[PDB]
């Protein structure tokens, strides 16, 4: 919509002739930023997004024994996820009475949905994540954009032939050996409500087609190959320290597997 002017702000001048990071790619070939620590001034971004009164929805599915992960997930989200912005948590669960009573900061709310236009009217952006995880560092408005995916932490250095895309030509998820930008992992993705709904609709229809044909993150990866994300998140945003350690290229570990 219409955007008011930013206030005067004091911060270091960007350096045109100094690369931001010399160890990683910070922009895709379709000119989407790749979000790594060092690439963004969060003060500028926070102003931009607050001036739009941005609301973020955070969606998590917690079925069967996965309800046990909700307490740490929500407690740590309170510490690290979009602090200062309006947040609406949506917990989808088969056990509503097992959702823990977590204390929320001001301007934050939680809805329990037992297991669409509702999302369009309540939030600007949707962020869809796995519940068996914890936040350990800042995850903020730097991620927000019409459509984002996150690099699979196991594969960010891999050649595309090694990616575990669907390789059966009979599947709607098929990606040939000579195609592919990145291997995205579906544990952390999101976008505008409209773009997230477009993605999940496309996935659901392709999954139904495969099922009809007797075939069963492959669908996410096919979608993002054919509909390029407007930001890509580095593996800072979806990590497993037990399996992968803390490499020098990761300045922060923001959202991590629970051991
Ligand atoms: Hg930089
Ligand atoms: Hg979602
Ligand atoms: Hg899809
Ligand atoms: Hg999908």
From Swiss-Prot:
Binding of an alpha-L-fucosyl-(1->2)-beta-D-galactosyl derivative occurs at 152, 164, 217, 240
- Give the way it sits in the membrane: Single-pass type II membrane protein
What cellular-component terms does GO give this entry? extracellular region; Golgi apparatus; Golgi cisterna membrane; Golgi membrane; vesicle
Effect on the protein upon substituting residue 185 to M: In allele Bw08
Describe, from its UniProt entry, the tissues in which this protein is expressed.
Expressed at high levels in testis. Also expressed in pancreas, uterus and lung and salivary gland.
Active site (record annotation):
217 (nucleophile)
| Functional summary from the UniProt entry | This protein is the basis of the ABO blood group system. The histo-blood group ABO involves three carbohydrate antigens: A, B, and H. A, B, and AB individuals express a glycosyltransferase activity that converts the H antigen to the A antigen (by addition of UDP-GalNAc) or to the B antigen (by addition of UDP-Gal), whereas O individuals lack such activity.
Identify its protein family: Belongs to the glycosyltransferase 6 family.
Protein name as catalogued: Histo-blood group ABO system transferase
- Which residues of the complete protein appear here? 64 to 345 of 354
């Amino acid at each position: 919509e219409f955007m008011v002017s930013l206030p005067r702000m004091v911060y270091p001048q960007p350096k045109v002739l100094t690369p931001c990071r010399k160890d990683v790619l910070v922009v895709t070939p379709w000119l989407a930023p790749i979000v790594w620590e060092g690439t963004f001034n969060i003060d500028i971004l926070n102003e931009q997004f607050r001036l739009q009164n941005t609301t973020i929805g955070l969606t998590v599915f917690a079925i069967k024994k996965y309800v046990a992960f909700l307490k740490l997930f929500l407690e740590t989200a309170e510490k690290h996820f979009m602090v200062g912005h309006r947040v609406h948590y949506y917990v989808f669960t088969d056990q509503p009475a097992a959702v823990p009573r977590v204390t929320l900061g001001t301007g934050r709310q939680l809805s329990v949905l037992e297991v669409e236009r509702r999302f369009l009217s309540e939030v600007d952006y949707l962020v869809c994540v796995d519940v068996d995880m914890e936040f350990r560092d800042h995850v903020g408005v730097e991620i927000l954009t019409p459509l984002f995916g996150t690099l699979h932490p196991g594969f960010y250095g891999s050649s595309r032939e090694a990616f575990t895309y669907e390789r059966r030509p009979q599947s709607q998820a098929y990606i040939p050996k000579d195609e592919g930008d990145f291997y995205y992992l579906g544990g952390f993705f999101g976008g505008s409500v409209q773009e997230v709904q477009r993605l999940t609709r496309a996935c659901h229809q392709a999954m139904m087609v495969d099922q009809a044909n007797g075939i069963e993150d492959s669908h996410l990866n096919k979608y993002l190959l054919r509909h390029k994300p407007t930001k890509v998140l580095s593996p800072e945003y979806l990590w497993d320290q037990q399996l992968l350690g803390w490499p020098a290229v990761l300045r922060k570990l923001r959202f991590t597997a629970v051991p």
